[PDB]
Amino acid sequence: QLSEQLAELEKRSGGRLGVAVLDTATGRRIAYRGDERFPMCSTFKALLAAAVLARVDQGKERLDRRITYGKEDLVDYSPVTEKHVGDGMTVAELCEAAITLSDNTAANLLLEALGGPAALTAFLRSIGDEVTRLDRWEPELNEAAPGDPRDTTTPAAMAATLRTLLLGDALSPASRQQLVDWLVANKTGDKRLRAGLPADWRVGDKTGTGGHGTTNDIAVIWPPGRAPIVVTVYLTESQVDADARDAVIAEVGRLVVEAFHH
């Protein structure tokens, strides 16, 4: 039913819509184009922060380590890092900025601390994600060119990977709760999945936005009284405007709510 509603929603979206809903109460998944590749754009920053925290868990990184950088390290969309060229930022502060404000320079500095896009991809391979790949840095990874596999995931693979990292035991309990806290504190998603949820539904999300009419949102959501659900939404090649693409994701939110609580 939800799958058929998503097909109709795609007709209104002006583009190609991919959705996966993973219910951790039952382990059951509902998906629409769930095995098709979509551009991640900034949704990869959730995975980036998880890879940094995995290093912390292994004693190979510290949350309080200070990273210094210069004005020429700055790329566009860097609202937190552009303020701290003088004093630098800690690893924890860069993760917070990358997740909650989608800070691009913060993501590049964290990628540099990992060993780059190829290091993030290998991390994902190590935890059993055979599909997701990061190839480029900020901002070129947002190109979102149709037919280009670079910097892509599938909705089902991303949902499975988020389940493992945020809810399973790939990360330490402190690391997983910290990552969830950053996602719950996200400031960029108010018009997307969040806009489709009732107030008492706890939600952590990470948005992505890029070329070729690409608007994404990935989330973990706790409906009251139950186990959480992981929801990934990818919309690309969409010919409606940015606000309408946001509204498509908010409607996925409403459809999920109605599927799980009637």
Residue numbers in the entry: 28 to 58, 60 to 238, 240 to 252, 254 to 292
Article excerpt on this structure:
Here, we explore and test these notions using resurrected Precambrian β-lactamases11 as scaffolds for the engineering of completely new active sites. Of these systems, resurrected Precambrian β-lactamases have been thoroughly characterized in terms of their structure, function and stability. These putative ancestral proteins have been shown to be highly stable and able to efficiently degrade several antibiotics. A hydrophobic-to-ionizable amino acid replacement generates a buried (or partially buried) residue with the perturbed properties that are useful in catalysis and conformational flexibility assists the generation of a completely new active site by facilitating substrate and transition-state binding. We have shown that, when using resurrected Precambrian β-lactamases as scaffolds for protein engineering, a minimalist design approach based on this mechanism leads to levels of catalysis for the Kemp elimination reaction of up to approximately seven orders of magnitude above the rate of the uncatalysed reaction, as well as to significant ester hydrolysis activity.
Consequently, we used NMR relaxation determinations (see Methods section and Supplementary Methods) on the β-lactamase encoded by the most probabilistic sequence at the GNCA node (GNCAMP β-lactamase) to guide our design of a new active site. This putative ancestral protein displays a large number of residues with conformational contribution to the relaxation rates determined by NMR (see the comparison with the modern TEM-1 β-lactamase shown in Fig. 3). A large accumulation of such residues is visually apparent in the region encompassing helix h1 (residues 26–41), helix h11 (residues 271–290) and the loops 225–229 and 252–257. Residue 229 within this region appears as a suitable target for the generation of a new active site through a hydrophobic-to-ionizable residue replacement. A substantially buried and highly conserved tryptophan residue is present at position 229 in both modern and reconstructed Precambrian β-lactamases. In the case of the wild-type enzymes, a clear increase can be seen in the flexibility of residues 252 through to the h11 helix upon moving from TEM-1 and BL to the GNCAMP to GNCA4 β-lactamases, which are the residues that are primarily involved in forming the cavity creating the de novo active site. The flexibility of this region appears indeed to follow the general activity trend described above.
